Amino acid sequence: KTVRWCAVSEHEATKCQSFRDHMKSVIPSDGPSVACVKKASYLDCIRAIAANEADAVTLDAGLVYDAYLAPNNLKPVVAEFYGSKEDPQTFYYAVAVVKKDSGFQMNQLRGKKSCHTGLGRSAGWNIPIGLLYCDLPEPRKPLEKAVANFFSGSCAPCADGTDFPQLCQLCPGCGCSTLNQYFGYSGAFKCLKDGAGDVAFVKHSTIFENLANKADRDQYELLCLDNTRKPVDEYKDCHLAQVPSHTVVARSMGGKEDLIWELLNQAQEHFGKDKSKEFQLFSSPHGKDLLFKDSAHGFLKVPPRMDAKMYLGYEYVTAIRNLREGTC
Structure with missing residues (x-):
């Protein structure tokens, strides 16, 4: 029942610990729970997840692309809407x-x-x-x-x-x-x-x-x-x-997406936009866009067995590869 979120900075860790602490204050221990892991960069979190040292991290599109690649093989599971x-x-x-x-x-x-x-x-x-x-x-x-x-x-x-x-x-x-x-x-x-x-x-x-x-x-x-x-x-x-x-990513095999969505949905319900005054998921006294972008309204469950390159689109993948590989 414990989802290990990865933070890429000290404000994100602090926000993660606070998120965790509030979740415990509202849910039966048989429910989903947070563990806060702290890394130095999105790529160090991607590696940790793949390495079974963390479970979830929310990322922008270029990193979703990176997380997918081997040896990472991470896949999109939840989105911010x-x-x-x-x-x-x-x-x-x-x-x-x-x-x-x-x-x-x-x-x-x-x-x-x-x-x-x-x-x-x-x-x-x-x-x-x-x-x-x-x-x-x-x-x-x-x-x-x-x-x-x-x-x-x-x-x-x-x-x-x-x-x-x-x-x-x-x-x-x-x-x-x-x-x-x-x-x-x-x-x-x-x-x-x-x-x-x-x-x-x-x-x-x-x-x-x-x-x-x-x-x-x-x-x-x-x-x-x-x-x-x-x-x-x-x-x-x-x-x-x-x-x-x-987009939230998780290991393709053994990613715990089931529990991840549970935590995030139960999270949005409990502290999403407007839902709470003691804890806000899309803001923080510690910074802007910690863990999730502040302009987020909640989460949507991403389509089952959604391959990254499919989630990103053929064009985006082409563009990145062109710019990275320069192959013509």
Whole structure:
């Protein structure tokens, strides 16, 4: 009945010990219980779990990918959802928004200008650049220069514009802060709305956050991997990658997922959003996003026998592998 959670820092351990202590204060010992393990990094927790030294850890998508790999063979078991119970979000979609009828598809991106949320961000850089990897003109290493060589001018916040200036052409300096009008989520969208670039690599919610009505959203379009375009509302059938926000992983064999979901469900019921004032699962006096993201609403039980690469999606896996392996 004891689930050994892995923390990757001292605040997470403290929060874990407190979570544990409150759970004991509300459940019959025949119920699920927490044990707090403390590691130095997500990868050290992944290894501990595989090594039967811990049972569960919640991770972002790239780490879910790593945990899956051998010798780890960890698998997704529970997800954090957001938004609502009716319409619970567990994923975000990396999309490629463009101006209506700007006459080019995903496979025709070479020679256009790009707006990225920031270099190194998943939806804004990793996912799209990973997907386009082999389209980039060689020499492909260093990647920054190749990207600069693929687009006629870009805005890649946090890029080394001293060495690859073309990357800041749309935002001189590639300022890695909001001091740069083209930084982050709204920044990249503004870059395209302003007509500075042809395409904006952002997540689906971004355009909805920046545009009032359908009419507004209708001057825009999304590029689909099948080299066709579709309305922005259709992002679910037209995205670069469907990415899980935060996923709990456990050993594929002997992971105790059964008990893990029990603890987490009984956890959400007892101290989920609004449920408790003595203990809050999605906050902590000790820090932001300790163990679970603070913006989480609860958990959903992930589909039975859900292989990681299936949970991540063929595209995401392709992107990561391209960026890691550089094989073409």
